[PDB]
Design a protein around this motif. Sequence first.
Motif, PDB file in Angstrom:
ATOM      1  N   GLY A  54       0.803  -1.205   0.000  1.00  0.00           N
ATOM      2  CA  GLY A  54       0.000   0.000   0.000  1.00  0.00           C
ATOM      3  C   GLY A  54       0.840   1.260   0.000  1.00  0.00           C
ATOM      4  N   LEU A  55       1.936   1.264   0.761  1.00  0.00           N
ATOM      5  CA  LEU A  55       2.795   2.443   0.779  1.00  0.00           C
ATOM      6  C   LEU A  55       3.442   2.681  -0.579  1.00  0.00           C
ATOM      7  N   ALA A 104       0.837   4.157  -2.782  1.00  0.00           N
ATOM      8  CA  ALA A 104       0.526   5.522  -2.376  1.00  0.00           C
ATOM      9  C   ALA A 104       1.584   6.493  -2.871  1.00  0.00           C
ATOM     10  N   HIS A 116       1.009   9.595  -5.485  1.00  0.00           N
ATOM     11  CA  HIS A 116       1.274  10.981  -5.162  1.00  0.00           C
ATOM     12  C   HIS A 116       2.201  11.597  -6.191  1.00  0.00           C
ATOM     13  N   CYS A 159      -0.213  12.530  -9.121  1.00  0.00           N
ATOM     14  CA  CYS A 159      -1.047  13.711  -9.079  1.00  0.00           C
ATOM     15  C   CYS A 159      -0.236  15.005  -9.084  1.00  0.00           C
ATOM     16  N   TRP A 212      -0.084  20.904  -5.845  1.00  0.00           N
ATOM     17  CA  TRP A 212      -1.012  21.498  -4.909  1.00  0.00           C
ATOM     18  C   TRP A 212      -0.422  22.661  -4.169  1.00  0.00           C
ATOM     19  N   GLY A 250      -7.532   3.981   9.310  1.00  0.00           N
ATOM     20  CA  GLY A 250      -7.055   4.163   7.949  1.00  0.00           C
ATOM     21  C   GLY A 250      -8.179   4.443   6.971  1.00  0.00           C
ATOM     22  N   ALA A 290      -8.593   7.916   4.822  1.00  0.00           N
ATOM     23  CA  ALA A 290      -8.658   7.947   3.362  1.00  0.00           C
ATOM     24  C   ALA A 290      -9.938   8.642   2.897  1.00  0.00           C
ATOM     25  N   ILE A 327      -9.789  12.499   3.512  1.00  0.00           N
ATOM     26  CA  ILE A 327      -8.900  13.208   2.600  1.00  0.00           C
ATOM     27  C   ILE A 327      -9.496  13.255   1.200  1.00  0.00           C
ATOM     28  N   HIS A 328     -10.086  12.076   0.765  1.00  0.00           N
ATOM     29  CA  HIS A 328     -10.719  12.067  -0.547  1.00  0.00           C
ATOM     30  C   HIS A 328     -11.810  13.127  -0.632  1.00  0.00           C
ATOM     31  N   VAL A 336     -10.310  16.821  -0.706  1.00  0.00           N
ATOM     32  CA  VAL A 336      -9.688  17.128  -1.988  1.00  0.00           C
ATOM     33  C   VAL A 336     -10.742  17.324  -3.069  1.00  0.00           C
ATOM     34  N   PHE A 384      -8.641  20.661  -8.753  1.00  0.00           N
ATOM     35  CA  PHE A 384      -7.997  19.602  -9.509  1.00  0.00           C
ATOM     36  C   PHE A 384      -8.631  19.302 -10.858  1.00  0.00           C
TER      37      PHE A 384
HETATM   38  C1  BCL Z   1      -3.216  14.243  -5.189  1.00  0.00           C
HETATM   39  C2  BCL Z   1      -2.597  14.765  -3.884  1.00  0.00           C
HETATM   40  C3  BCL Z   1      -3.591  15.291  -2.850  1.00  0.00           C
HETATM   41  C4  BCL Z   1      -3.858  14.247  -1.770  1.00  0.00           C
HETATM   42  C5  BCL Z   1      -4.826  13.321  -1.934  1.00  0.00           C
HETATM   43  C6  BCL Z   1      -4.873  12.143  -1.207  1.00  0.00           C
HETATM   44  C7  BCL Z   1      -5.911  11.214  -1.274  1.00  0.00           C
HETATM   45  C8  BCL Z   1      -7.158  11.251  -2.100  1.00  0.00           C
HETATM   46  C9  BCL Z   1      -5.512  10.291  -0.417  1.00  0.00           C
HETATM   47  C10 BCL Z   1      -4.296  10.643   0.136  1.00  0.00           C
HETATM   48  C11 BCL Z   1      -3.806   9.704   1.068  1.00  0.00           C
HETATM   49  C12 BCL Z   1      -2.708   9.905   1.841  1.00  0.00           C
HETATM   50  N1  BCL Z   1      -1.968  11.069   1.705  1.00  0.00           N
HETATM   51 MG1  BCL Z   1      -2.186  12.545   0.258  1.00  0.00          MG
HETATM   52  N2  BCL Z   1      -2.847  14.133  -0.866  1.00  0.00           N
HETATM   53  C13 BCL Z   1      -2.186  15.306  -0.950  1.00  0.00           C
HETATM   54  C14 BCL Z   1      -1.119  15.739  -0.155  1.00  0.00           C
HETATM   55  C15 BCL Z   1      -0.548  14.990   0.822  1.00  0.00           C
HETATM   56  C16 BCL Z   1       0.471  15.372   1.726  1.00  0.00           C
HETATM   57  C17 BCL Z   1       1.167  16.728   1.811  1.00  0.00           C
HETATM   58  C18 BCL Z   1       1.712  17.443   0.606  1.00  0.00           C
HETATM   59  O1  BCL Z   1       1.524  17.189   2.827  1.00  0.00           O
HETATM   60  C19 BCL Z   1       0.729  14.327   2.522  1.00  0.00           C
HETATM   61  C20 BCL Z   1       1.716  14.206   3.642  1.00  0.00           C
HETATM   62  C21 BCL Z   1      -0.082  13.282   2.158  1.00  0.00           C
HETATM   63  C22 BCL Z   1      -0.080  12.026   2.788  1.00  0.00           C
HETATM   64  C23 BCL Z   1      -0.998  11.018   2.614  1.00  0.00           C
HETATM   65  C24 BCL Z   1      -0.995   9.845   3.562  1.00  0.00           C
HETATM   66  C25 BCL Z   1      -1.471  10.432   4.889  1.00  0.00           C
HETATM   67  C26 BCL Z   1      -2.162   8.995   2.938  1.00  0.00           C
HETATM   68  C27 BCL Z   1      -1.710   7.678   2.362  1.00  0.00           C
HETATM   69  C28 BCL Z   1      -0.359   7.272   2.863  1.00  0.00           C
HETATM   70  C29 BCL Z   1      -0.217   5.778   2.663  1.00  0.00           C
HETATM   71  O2  BCL Z   1       0.485   5.283   1.917  1.00  0.00           O
HETATM   72  O3  BCL Z   1      -1.228   5.124   2.953  1.00  0.00           O
HETATM   73  C30 BCL Z   1      -1.208   4.164   4.067  1.00  0.00           C
HETATM   74  C31 BCL Z   1      -1.321   2.717   3.606  1.00  0.00           C
HETATM   75  C32 BCL Z   1      -2.332   2.220   2.922  1.00  0.00           C
HETATM   76  C33 BCL Z   1      -3.521   3.059   2.568  1.00  0.00           C
HETATM   77  C34 BCL Z   1      -2.583   0.700   2.807  1.00  0.00           C
HETATM   78  C35 BCL Z   1      -3.556   0.419   1.639  1.00  0.00           C
HETATM   79  C36 BCL Z   1      -4.201  -0.928   1.960  1.00  0.00           C
HETATM   80  C37 BCL Z   1      -4.628  -1.692   0.739  1.00  0.00           C
HETATM   81  C38 BCL Z   1      -3.610  -1.621  -0.397  1.00  0.00           C
HETATM   82  C39 BCL Z   1      -5.893  -1.016   0.314  1.00  0.00           C
HETATM   83  C40 BCL Z   1      -6.389  -1.757  -0.867  1.00  0.00           C
HETATM   84  C41 BCL Z   1      -7.798  -1.238  -1.051  1.00  0.00           C
HETATM   85  C42 BCL Z   1      -8.476  -2.129  -2.093  1.00  0.00           C
HETATM   86  C43 BCL Z   1      -8.827  -1.255  -3.294  1.00  0.00           C
HETATM   87  C44 BCL Z   1      -9.734  -2.746  -1.534  1.00  0.00           C
HETATM   88  C45 BCL Z   1     -10.037  -3.906  -2.432  1.00  0.00           C
HETATM   89  C46 BCL Z   1      -8.962  -4.946  -2.218  1.00  0.00           C
HETATM   90  C47 BCL Z   1      -9.510  -6.370  -2.169  1.00  0.00           C
HETATM   91  C48 BCL Z   1      -8.384  -7.377  -1.863  1.00  0.00           C
HETATM   92  C49 BCL Z   1      -9.975  -6.658  -3.570  1.00  0.00           C
HETATM   93  N3  BCL Z   1      -0.864  13.696   1.126  1.00  0.00           N
HETATM   94  C50 BCL Z   1      -2.727  16.187  -2.041  1.00  0.00           C
HETATM   95  C51 BCL Z   1      -3.715  17.149  -1.437  1.00  0.00           C
HETATM   96  N4  BCL Z   1      -3.871  11.796  -0.327  1.00  0.00           N
HETATM   97  C52 BCL Z   1      -4.698   8.445   0.943  1.00  0.00           C
HETATM   98  C53 BCL Z   1      -5.364   7.994   2.270  1.00  0.00           C
HETATM   99  O4  BCL Z   1      -4.851   8.011   3.245  1.00  0.00           O
HETATM  100  O5  BCL Z   1      -6.248   7.096   2.222  1.00  0.00           O
HETATM  101  C54 BCL Z   1      -5.873   5.763   2.897  1.00  0.00           C
HETATM  102  C55 BCL Z   1      -5.940   8.983   0.139  1.00  0.00           C
HETATM  103  O6  BCL Z   1      -6.830   8.163  -0.334  1.00  0.00           O
END
Ligand code: BCL
Lengths: 64, 47, 32, 306, 49, 49, 49, 49, 49, 49, 294, 38, 38, 38, 38, 38, 38, 38, 38, 38
Positions: free
Chosen positions: H30-31, H34, H38, H41, H47, O16, O20, O23-24, O27, O33
């Motif tokens: 997931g990381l 992610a 990022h 985008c 942003w 988590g 997610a 934040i979604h 944004v 965007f």
């Molecule tokens: C385009 C940029 C947009 C923005 C839009 C988003 C959006 C939208 C999201 C994030 C999310 C995150 N953002 Mg961002 N984000 C921005 C700017 C930032 C800034 C900043 C500049 O300071 C920071 C520090 C962050 C940091 C972060 C983390 C806090 C977070 C995800 C980290 C990680 O890997 O996930 C931690 C680890 C994981 C998520 C593990 C994933 C687990 C598994 C892989 C999930 C699978 C799901 C699957 C589809 C379900 C079906 C599976 C079955 C098996 C079939 N963003 C700008 C504003 N950001 C994401 C969030 O946190 O949601 C979780 C989120 O969706």
Amino acid sequence: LPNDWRLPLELDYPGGLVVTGRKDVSNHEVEQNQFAMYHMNVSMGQGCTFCHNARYFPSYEIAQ
Amino acid sequence: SPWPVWSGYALCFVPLAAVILGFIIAARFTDKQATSAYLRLDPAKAN
Amino acid sequence: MNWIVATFMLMFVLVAFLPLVVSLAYTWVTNP
Amino acid sequence: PIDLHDEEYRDGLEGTIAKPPGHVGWMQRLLGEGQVGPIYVGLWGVISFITFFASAFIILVDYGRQVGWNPIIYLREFWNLAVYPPPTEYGLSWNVPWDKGGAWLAATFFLHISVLTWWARLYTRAKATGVGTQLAWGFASALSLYFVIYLFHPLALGNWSAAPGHGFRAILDWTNYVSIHWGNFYYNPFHMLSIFFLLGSTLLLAMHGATIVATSKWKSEMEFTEMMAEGPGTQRAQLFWRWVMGWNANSYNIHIWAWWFAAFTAITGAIGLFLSGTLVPDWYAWGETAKIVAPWPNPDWAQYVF
Amino acid sequence: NDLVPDQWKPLFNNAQWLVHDIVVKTIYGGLIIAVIAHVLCWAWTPWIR
Amino acid sequence: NDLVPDQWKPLFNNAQWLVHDIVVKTIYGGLIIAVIAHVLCWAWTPWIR
Amino acid sequence: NDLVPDQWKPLFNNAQWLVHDIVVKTIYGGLIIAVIAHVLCWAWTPWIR
Amino acid sequence: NDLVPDQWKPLFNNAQWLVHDIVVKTIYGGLIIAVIAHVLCWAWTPWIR
Amino acid sequence: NDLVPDQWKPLFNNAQWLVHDIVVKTIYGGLIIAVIAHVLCWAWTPWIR
Amino acid sequence: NDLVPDQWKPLFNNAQWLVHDIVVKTIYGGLIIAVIAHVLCWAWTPWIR
Amino acid sequence: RALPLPSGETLPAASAEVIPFSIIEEFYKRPGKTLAARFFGVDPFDFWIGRFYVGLFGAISIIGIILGVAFYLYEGVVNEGTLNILAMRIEPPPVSQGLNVDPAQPGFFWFLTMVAATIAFVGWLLRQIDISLKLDMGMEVPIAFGAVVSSWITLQWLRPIAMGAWGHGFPLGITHHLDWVSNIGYQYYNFFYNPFHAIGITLLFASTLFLHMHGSAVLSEAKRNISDQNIHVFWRNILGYSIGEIGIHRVAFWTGAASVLFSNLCIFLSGTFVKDWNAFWGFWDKMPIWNGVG
Amino acid sequence: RPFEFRTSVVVSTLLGLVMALLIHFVVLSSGAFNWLRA
Amino acid sequence: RPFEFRTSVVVSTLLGLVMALLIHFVVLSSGAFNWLRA
Amino acid sequence: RPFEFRTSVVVSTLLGLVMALLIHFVVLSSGAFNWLRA
Amino acid sequence: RPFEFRTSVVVSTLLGLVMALLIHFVVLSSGAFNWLRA
Amino acid sequence: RPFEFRTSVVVSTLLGLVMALLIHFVVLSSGAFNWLRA
Amino acid sequence: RPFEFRTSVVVSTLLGLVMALLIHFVVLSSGAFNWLRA
Amino acid sequence: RPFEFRTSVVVSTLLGLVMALLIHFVVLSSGAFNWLRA
Amino acid sequence: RPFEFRTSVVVSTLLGLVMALLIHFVVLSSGAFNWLRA
Amino acid sequence: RPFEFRTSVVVSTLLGLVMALLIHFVVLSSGAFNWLRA
Ligand code: BCL
Ligand code: BCL
Ligand code: BCL
Ligand code: BCL
Ligand code: BCL
Ligand code: BCL
Ligand code: BCL
Ligand code: BCL
Ligand SMILES: [Fe+3]
């Protein structure tokens, strides 16, 4: 009040806003009425009993 | 003209008579059955 | 004038609140 | 004859979900017993849950559309958001745009289904354990008023707009608007009976609780054991009220009084609300024909204006 | 408990049978009267139109 | 206890069978009447248009 | 209670098998009717456009 | 519980270890995704600006 | 119940010690990242001005 | 037990003593930082004027 | 033979025995433990006339009762002449008169009625303390009654005195105190929005709910052979919590007492510090967290 | 008995009645059939 | 036999019914099909 | 024993259903797809 | 024994998901965007 | 012994999360940083 | 005895008295008889 | 005894006193006698 | 004794007194007799 | 124990946190420091 709201001035106003016991108006008309009444309340410094005698709202005894 | 209209009686004096009558009858019956004679624990022992 | 007496009467309202709290705390203490 | 153990633990559909019991601790020290324990889920139990979850989901998603899916604004104005029934145009018609009044109808339907299934659950679980079914009939008495508010009164007026609107502040607005619409809602006589019964109910509750707590020292709290044999506590409780107000009741009658007061509240309320829109259009104008309005020829209004 | 026929023996008691008979007779009479009444309000003024 | 066929023996008691027969007959009759009523309200005014 | 095949023996009782059969048959019929109804309301007026 | 190493022997049972492996693997995947998302985008429209 | 040093023996169990270690490490890492992020937010546009 | 000095023996348990020590150290550090921050906020712009 | 039972059932044949009621009154008399006799060394009356216990507090109360009823009847029947209880209104002195009261000016009899009623109520409260003190039960009922007495004190003494007009007390008389309530409720807009008000009605509805549930619970297990754990099991099956026998009565007492306290607070506050309730909530919108996101 | 027959008939007759009532109400309130002065 | 079959069929027939009803309501209230005077 | 399998499948199907429903509602109400008279 | 593993995974997967989603939504509602007709 | 360790970590991770969220909200809504179209 | 006789006579006298009183009050208040200055 | 004598005298002296008081009030308030400045 | 005599005399004297009082009030308030300045 | 130690530390950390938050909010809202666009 909602920000889109304005005082409705396209009515005859000799008594066009009346709502009590009409039986052809529902809670939506009553809501518009209460909006206008609260506006008149904030405009005037005094309270809601300034001109109404809340026991009977259609009464005209206060003369304000 | 001097008299209350019909439905003044039905709507207001069914409550005002029925509720007072009901209270005065229900109180009589509850107090009767309560102050009646039935099983109790002795005052000289339990207390 | 108005505000001194008003505060003093609010004191009495809170005093009316008082006994219920003593009831609650007595139950908490005497029921370990 | 009745096994309680097999009625406390029995898998699923016929048993409880949360098998391990738990302790709250602080509840134990202040509320008496303090164990959470298992909760039984049956056939009727799952239905009410899913229907309530459907109605709540419908309503909660429709809040987000109003704020533009903004969670900051969504959290700020949560308490004054609402969904409203259709307007006076197309009064009873079921074909309305979703945003105007369409979302309200589905939500209220699923809410109705959940309520009725919960009643069925109450009745069935009461019969299963061997106790009487009085609680279910009391809940039916309250459902009478609930159904008059949401179903029977909008019907027979022609408008779905007479019902409330699924909001925290929307219900206060509904109360105020109805009272204003009929005019001087205080004068409605069945409203007077309902207030009488409600304040009597609170009176009885406070009194019964207070006297039982005061005489707790002699184990008068166990009302079931005392019903077979009255101990010193119940004997003292009767004497206190006999000297104060001249009459008293034993432990069996006082609960009859409680039940009937609580139920008469809701029954008289429903009967009184139903008549406002249909038989008597104006309540204050009716009171002056019944000769119960104070004449008040010239009041002193200096008090009310600031 | 032996006045009811064999096919319905496990369901109906003896006393429950005569009641059932009364209920069936009443339902038939009510249905006949209902049909007559609907033919009449029809002839008066139709409601589908 | 033995009037139901073998294939459905574990499920149905004896008394539960006759009631199931009544239910099936009623459902069939109701479906026939429902189909007739539906054909009639289109010969009156169609809903889909 | 051995009417179910060996592969699914640990899971299904004997009575739970026949109901499962009824459920599968009903689901298949419902899916066929759903597909037909969807083809019809697309021929009428398409929803994606 | 003897599949877990000695330094974590008290904290983890033997079943609790494999699920924790699954959790770590999922978190790493997931990381990575992610970080890729990022970078994308940002290349699209930044942003912070 | 004997992996913790003597000074802190009355307070910490054995298992409670390793979690404490994890917590301290995480807090240190978080503080370093927080300091870096503020230096960056300052170089961008100062807030006090 | 018995780690606390005699003058404070009736008040403090053994375990309660070390926590206290932590509390006193934290309070001293916090006060030093607070004094520094105040001197800085004064040199920037005085508030009494 | 047949054993009469407290619930009316007669059993088909324990230290329990059939004791007539009189026995238990003579044993629990114990004259001389009056709260007043503690302070004076003696109580003047304590002679249980009829079924009613009499004390020093009872006499001042009965004085208040007789005088109050007489003044209430003198008002509205004389000087009004309506001869209809519903039509008569007993009104406080006007706001222009101020705090001072004068026999020549109108409203003098309303004041007498109010003072007599206050004396009667307080005397009743002390009498309850007293009769409970003789039985050695406890002091819960005096507290529960003192709550509603304090509500009456707030409405007719504290809030009028703080504003000073004496016209603010609600006029007595059936179907006219409602007119006062309605004119006061609308004077400050949205009394519903008032927070202390909304807690009172919450507790009132919750109290009616608790009463219905407790009554139905005890009535359901009244006449049947069961383990006495059946009701607890039923409560655990529905909502997954059983409060216990001693728990429900505490909760009843507490909720009942709290409702009126919050209510009297809300009214006293509305009169003195808040002009309208819509302006009170004006601060919420501008909370920093979301003041600019719109 | 894994499935009680009477539960099935109870839920069946309740669902059917509710569904007939709801459809009847919707069709009446739609105002598209000229039935009872429409 | 950990998973009771009847729980599955109960939840299945509840979810299916709710879903059919919700879709039928949404489609009717959208007003895009000319069905029952639209 | 440490993790009941059925709890996992229950929470999985609930979360999946809620998520599908929420996404379809959001996409429909956005009005960016010309679907059902848009 | 003191710290149950499953409590950790439950709270982790709830936090988590909520994060997610939040934040979604932020944004999307910011409108910066050009995503879904913006 | 005077304190359970897990209570400390629970309250710590709750307070820290709430505080980060509140500061992030305040800074975003102040509109002084030109972040997400400002 | 399926019924207590005295319950019958009590309810009979009460209903009869209430009914006489109600009819006497309706007829008086109708003002159609010229009775007591009408 | 079928009736306690003292109950009779108590109710008699209460009813008589109330009745005298009520008649005295009504006559005074009627204003038809020129008594105490009328 | 199926019926207590004293209950009969109590209810009789109460009903008679109430009835005399009500009739006297109604006749006085009708204002059709010229009694006490009318 | 005349005072449980943990009650003291709980009330201390609550009062300190509330006080820091209140002072911060007052100083920010006073608008006298030119901090975050002021
Ligand atoms: C385009 C940029 C947009 C923005 C839009 C988003 C959006 C939208 C999201 C994030 C999310 C995150 N953002 Mg961002 N984000 C921005 C700017 C930032 C800034 C900043 C500049 O300071 C920071 C520090 C962050 C940091 C972060 C983390 C806090 C977070 C995800 C980290 C990680 O890997 O996930 C931690 C680890 C994981 C998520 C593990 C994933 C687990 C598994 C892989 C999930 C699978 C799901 C699957 C589809 C379900 C079906 C599976 C079955 C098996 C079939 N963003 C700008 C504003 N950001 C994401 C969030 O946190 O949601 C979780 C989120 O969706
Ligand atoms: C809009 C154009 C037409 C219209 C079009 C149609 C069409 C088309 C149909 C109907 C149908 C019917 N309409 Mg229509 N209908 C119209 C106007 C009316 C009017 C009237 C006021 O004008 C009436 C009274 C009715 C009434 C009816 C019933 C005759 C029938 C519905 C049966 C059903 O739902 O019950 C079913 C109830 C249940 C499933 C349970 C029944 C309960 C059992 C019988 C009672 C015994 C229970 C037993 C003791 C066990 C107890 C268990 C308990 C459930 C717990 N319609 C208008 C005029 N109507 C439907 C019908 O006839 O099909 C049969 C049909 O298809
Ligand atoms: C437009 C008008 C406003 C309104 C304006 C007010 C005002 C104004 C008040 C309330 C107050 C009350 N209202 Mg409000 N209220 C409104 C709408 C509502 C609604 C509703 C569903 O909408 C509800 C449930 C309530 C509920 C209530 C409670 C909050 C409270 C009840 C009074 C009480 O407990 O103490 C009343 C307690 C006493 C006075 C009783 C004293 C009794 C003494 C001790 C007994 C005397 C003995 C007597 C002579 C009998 C002798 C016995 C012998 C048998 C004869 N309001 C509307 C919106 N509401 C009242 C309150 O706050 O209480 C202070 C009040 O001040
Ligand atoms: C005029 C056409 C109107 C319309 C008006 C109605 C109305 C009104 C009704 C239906 C009902 C039904 N409609 Mg239609 N319906 C329309 C368009 C449709 C469309 C479509 C084009 O897509 C469909 C698929 C349907 C489908 C259906 C079924 C879902 C349902 C009845 C099926 C069945 O036989 O009953 C299942 C089986 C039975 C009901 C068993 C009946 C049981 C017994 C016979 C009941 C006897 C009751 C008796 C009177 C009680 C006294 C008996 C004592 C012994 C004396 N309708 C248009 C909009 N439709 C009916 C409904 O479901 O209610 C039941 C309903 O009332
Ligand atoms: C006209 C086209 C409208 C639309 C209107 C509807 C409506 C309206 C419905 C659906 C329903 C469905 N739609 Mg569609 N639908 C549209 C566009 C779509 C799109 C898309 C383009 O992306 C998709 C993917 C779908 C997909 C689906 C499925 C999710 C669902 C039914 C599938 C299935 O077979 O049922 C699964 C299997 C079954 C339902 C088993 C049936 C069981 C038995 C046969 C039921 C018998 C009932 C009987 C009458 C009761 C009496 C029987 C007694 C024995 C007498 N629709 C457009 C917007 N769609 C249906 C729904 O789900 O309701 C369930 C629904 O009613
Ligand atoms: C048209 C494009 C729209 C959009 C509209 C939707 C809609 C609408 C949906 C999704 C859904 C999904 N979208 Mg998309 N989506 C868009 C843009 C995106 C973007 C992006 C560019 O960043 C991403 C990452 C995604 C990612 C996703 C996944 C999170 C999710 C489904 C993944 C998966 O396979 O399901 C995980 C695995 C499954 C769902 C298993 C399915 C289980 C079985 C097959 C279900 C059968 C149901 C059956 C009908 C019931 C009857 C069966 C009985 C046996 C008869 N979308 C744009 C905005 N997206 C779907 C969602 O999550 O709902 C679940 C959803 O409905
Ligand atoms: C003038 C005509 C008015 C009218 C005015 C009244 C009034 C007024 C009354 C009736 C009453 C009655 N009317 Mg009429 N009534 C009218 C038109 C009708 C019409 C119609 C045309 O359809 C009908 C069917 C009736 C029918 C009736 C009966 C229902 C009823 C008395 C029947 C009976 O004998 O009493 C049943 C038997 C008895 C009452 C037993 C009496 C018992 C003993 C004799 C009572 C003695 C009381 C005694 C004074 C107490 C002191 C005794 C101590 C020993 C000292 N009226 C018109 C509108 N009618 C009377 C009523 O029912 O009151 C009860 C009533 O007062
Ligand atoms: C001036 C004429 C006014 C009028 C004004 C009054 C007034 C005023 C009163 C009456 C009272 C009575 N009137 Mg008148 N009354 C009028 C017209 C009528 C008419 C009519 C024409 O139809 C009738 C039938 C009556 C009939 C009656 C009786 C019902 C009643 C007293 C009867 C009796 O002797 O007392 C029954 C027997 C006694 C009262 C026993 C007295 C007991 C002892 C002697 C009381 C001593 C009290 C003592 C002062 C206390 C201190 C003593 C200590 C030892 C020191 N009046 C006109 C309208 N009438 C009196 C009433 O009933 O009050 C009781 C009342 O006060
Ligand atoms: Fe009780």
